[PDB]
Each structure stands twice: as C-alpha cells, then as structure tokens.
Amino acid sequence: ELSHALYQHDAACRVIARLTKEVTAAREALAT
Amino acid sequence: LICSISNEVPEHPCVSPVSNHVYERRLIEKYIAENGTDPINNQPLSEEQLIDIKVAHPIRPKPPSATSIPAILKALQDEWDAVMLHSFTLRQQLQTTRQELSHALYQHDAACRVIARLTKEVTAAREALATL
Amino acid sequence: EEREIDDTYIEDAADVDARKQAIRDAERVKEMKAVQKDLPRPSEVNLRPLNVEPPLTDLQKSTMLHYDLLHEPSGNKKGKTVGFGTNTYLEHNPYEKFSKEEL
Amino acid sequence: ANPHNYDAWFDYLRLVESDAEAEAVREVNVPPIQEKRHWKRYIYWINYALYEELEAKDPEQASLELIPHKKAKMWILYAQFRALGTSIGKCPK
Amino acid sequence: VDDLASVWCCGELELRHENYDEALRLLRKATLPARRAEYFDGSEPVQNRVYKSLKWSMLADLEESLGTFQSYDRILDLRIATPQIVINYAFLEEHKYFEESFKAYESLFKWPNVSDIWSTYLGGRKLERARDLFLDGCPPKYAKTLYLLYAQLEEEWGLARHAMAVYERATRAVEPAQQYDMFNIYIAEIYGVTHTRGIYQHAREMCLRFADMECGEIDRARAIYSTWKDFEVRHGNEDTIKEMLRIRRSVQATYFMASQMLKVSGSATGTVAPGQSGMDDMKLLEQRLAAEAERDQPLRAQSKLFVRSDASREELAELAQQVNPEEI
C-alpha cells in the first residue's frame, strides 16, 4: 500500500506540470 | 576422538584434571616425566592426577540421538531462538516502511493542497479571460 | 584529427542518455518492489486524480492494452522544488498519524 | 639515475655533473630536475656559477630568480632604462 | 581422373569400385587432410549416388569407418561430413552421439557445431557451452542470445568467461562492448569500479572517467592524471571542477604541446601566482613564432610594462632566431 502511494505521488506531480501550462497560457492571454 | 598433543587417534585416552582435554596415555605420560605439567595450560599435573576414560558406573547409557529427551529439548531452543530473529527482520523492516509511508503521506498531504489551488487558479484564469 | 574519440564520445553520450531514462522512469520502480485492471479503474471512478494515477500505472506496466508513452526531467525537478517550498511541529504530527494508521 | 648518482663533491665537481644530467634531461618531472639543478649550481665555484646557472635559465618567476642570482650600481641604472641585463651584471661584478 | 571417369561412369559401378581400389592404392601415397577429405567426400558421394540408386547409408558408414581408419582436423571435417549427411538423413541426435563419441574419445567437428548450434536454437545453453570446452564472434553472439532472453547478469558472466581466455588483444574486442553494455545496465559503485579495475590491464580511461564524474570526482581527475588529446581532456574536466586547476594542469602538461601550454597560459596571465604565471609565459614563449611575438607585444601594450623590457624581449626572441638559424 506504500508502493501504491508512490505511484500517485509521482503521477500527481506530472499532472501539476500540465496545470501550470494552462495557467501560463492564461497569463499570456490576460496580458494581450 | 583426537589427541591434542600429537593429533592422532589415541588408543589409550586419559583425561587430565587441571586442563580438561583428552590426551593419549603414552604421549601425556612422557610429557609428565619431562616436567610435571599439563601441556595446554602449563598447570601442575602428576600421573596419578590423570584419569583413564571409563564406563560411568551402573546406569546404562545410549548414544546421542534426536530421540533422546535432552537432545530434543535443546532442539526446541534452536527452533525458537531462530524464529525470534525472524521477527526482528520484520520488526526492523516495518520501522523503515512505516517511516517512509509517514513521510510519503505527508508529502501527499502537503502537495494535494497545491493541486487544489492550481485547479482553482487555472480555471479562474479561464473564467476571468473568457468573460473579457 | 580525432580517431576513436568520436566513438568514445558517442559511447559517453549514449551512456548519459541511459542514465537520464532509468532515473526518470519511476521512483518506486527504480527503488524496489500488480495485475491489469480496467474494471478496477472503472469501479474506482464510479475523483479525477485517482483516474490519472490509474492510467499511469497501466502505462508503466507495459486483458491489458498499452498506449501512453509521451509524458521531461527538467519539468519534474522544478515541480518537485516548488512543492517542497509549499510543504518540530510537523515532525510530531507525522509521528502521531503514523501511530494512528499503525493501530 | 647514474647521472644524478654521480656524487656532488665540492663545487665544480657538482656543477660539472649539473651540465651532464641537465643535458640528459633536456634531450630526453621537467620542473623538479630544473629545481635540483638550480640548487646544485647555487650550492657551488660560486664566482663561475653566476654565468653557468643563468646561461641555461632562459632555456629553462624568471625576473625574481635572475635578480637574486645576479645580486652593481651601473646594473641598476641599466635595468631602470631583462635577462641580458642580469647577464651583464653577473660577468662584470 | 576419378572425376572424369565418374563422368565416364555404362558400368558406373565398375568405375566406382575401381575408384575404391584406387583409394586403396592412393592411400599408400598418403602418409592427411585434403587428400583424405576429398577421399571421404568422394566415398560418401559414391554412397550418395548409391543413395540416389537406393544402393547406401551402411556402406557410407563403412567408408566413414575407413575415415576412422585414416591416419586430422580435416578428418574432423570428414566426421563433420558423415554427421552432415547423417543429419540430412531422414537421425540428427544419432550422429551427434558419434561426433560426441569422438570428442569424448579425446575439434574439427566444432565447425559443424557452429553449423549446427546456429540453427539448433530454433536449453541451448549447455549445447553452447560444449563449445567452450573446445572464436569471439561466437561468444558475443551467444551473449546476445541471453540478452534477447534478457538474462542480463548471466550474460555479463559470459564476458567473464571469454576474457579469461583471449588475453590483452582479442579480450579488448570483447571488452569494449562489454563495458558499454554493463555500464548501460546498472548505471552500485564498487562493483563497476572493480570492473574497470580488472579492465584496465586508452578508451577505457575515458569510459571510466565518464562514469566517475557522474557517480568521487577528484578520484577521476587522479585517474586521468594516472597523448596530447588525453592532456586536452583532463584539462577540460579540471575546468569543469573550476578554473584554478587548469593553469596548474599546464605545468604538468609541459613535461606541438607548447602551443597548448601557450593556449592555457594565454588566458592565465592574460586574465591576470600571477607573476609566476607571466614569467612562465616568458619561459614558454622562450621555450620554443611571430604570433607569440604579437602576444608578448600585446602584453607590453596592455600596460598604461616598459620599452626596455620589450626591446629586450624582442632581442631574446631574435636570439632564438639565431639559435634556430644556427640549427642544421
């Protein structure tokens, strides 16, 4: 059950990278 | 089975009563006639102090086997004393897994609050920008 | 005039690329030690973050279909450094919760 | 090893050997052989070692070593107006 | 002549038996390889045309027995041949038992084994090791088999077994691929470190150094410290550890190389111990050149260090022109 948490831990920090891109894309559009 | 002085199979074993060790009579006798001492510990020993190996007395014995009650009891010590170390292998490895789980679930609990805010902020930036 | 230096450098560069892929493959898989279950992923959803880790587990393992293989090391390091900033009193709250899960 | 093994006895004998082993080192630790050669020439004839050591110094930091070996009034006047000047002050004074 | 007679062979059987008696006579002349080899290939060919005639394997065994009577690696080619047709016969294992009877009796048959093991794969491991009891390409091939099966560590063992054989020549041919691969696998320090240690007895230094930098660093620098291109590398890695060593490296470097020592000294004092470095620039410029004159002239020009020392410098370089011109 510890090994199932490690997959979710590293899978979540991949999902934050796409969410940061959607925020970065938004900050560019707000400036325009 | 062996003589400690020569290293042969002694044909007349006599055990000393100062350093407990089975010597061959003919070998140890010459060692005593050289100087009255025990060869191993160098403690004083005479020929009368040396004693031949004997049948105990009147109680009949049997050879050392797995059946024999005392040999069976010392066996069950080996069983439990080995199984007690088997428990340490799982107690010590449990203290590493639960310690890594504690830091893992804390990093999970510290991170998922930041996933909840970015899902708020990236959707709020889409809610803000699309309306303008 | 290089000779057996480009071959040594190509082996050194191919050695570097293998060091980047093995480390960034997976944290749990690379360190130390499941059956494929699309019905378990379907039953668990019936919430979005749980479905993301389920597809991540099915991809790395490769009634089991593979597909996901495009989702790199630099973006994960900045993601790890950012989350570390957000995270005596913190040490005791982790020791108390570990005793609760142990019970 | 045989060239360095040639014993330094007196001043000119060791300085003669310094010519031998230095040429042997030259033709074939380049800095440590030069340093052991510098001590052999300096630790010698003392009048003739000023022209012997310095003659193979330019071939062998440079400004400081030359000033110590060369060490006269006219030489300082010639310097103020760098290996050739130390050579002029070594042979004359 | 037996071949032209064979072309002439209506009593072909007569010409063939005459070829056999001819073998009985020619055998006396043989006191062998290609003679015995063609003798066997032709005898078995007679049993092959006999086989086409349904006239044959038994007599083929008889002529092969005569090959046993022959009195050697080419004879092993003959055993390889009787085994070859014997397997082509439709009794594969039965012949292998015979070649095995010969080797157990004890090598030429092994070339047939490579002819056989190559397709015997399509378990095979012991079949392959039988060769090791009695060819680097074969070795790398077999390790590639286990690699295809991904036995990994077992495969590395094979490279252990090869190198104990061929010594510092062929062993290198094994060892370069073995290094590139095993480093590719585990990517524990001590084991691979030891492996390079075993290995060491030029490119090996570079693989090894490449390992050390990214898995102790100074230790690696010591290893490089332990040819011009090699000097150039070390200097690069030392620069990677920071600038200060590199000026230091050149001093090691001095003992075309003067161009490199000049290359290091250029930014050394040029960016500037600094006095020892400038005097070293003089010692190097004097060590063995018009661009260098432009360099010293640049160093003189840089001062807002004296026409006298400059003219003395050009004088010394002129003296170098004198010693150079004096050379035959």
PDB file of C-alpha atoms in Angstrom, chain E residues 29 94 103 168 203 208 236 247 293 303:
ATOM      1  CA  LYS E  29      50.683 -42.404 -51.248  1.00  0.00           C
ATOM      2  CA  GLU E  94      22.336 -40.340 -33.542  1.00  0.00           C
ATOM      3  CA  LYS E 103      35.400 -35.794 -28.821  1.00  0.00           C
ATOM      4  CA  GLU E 168      45.080  -8.369 -23.885  1.00  0.00           C
ATOM      5  CA  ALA E 203      39.334   4.462 -24.307  1.00  0.00           C
ATOM      6  CA  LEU E 208      35.711   5.047 -16.707  1.00  0.00           C
ATOM      7  CA  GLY E 236      38.638  20.158 -19.703  1.00  0.00           C
ATOM      8  CA  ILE E 247      46.532  26.788 -15.029  1.00  0.00           C
ATOM      9  CA  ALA E 293      55.636  37.962 -30.631  1.00  0.00           C
ATOM     10  CA  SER E 303      50.189  48.489 -19.744  1.00  0.00           C
TER      11      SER E 303
END
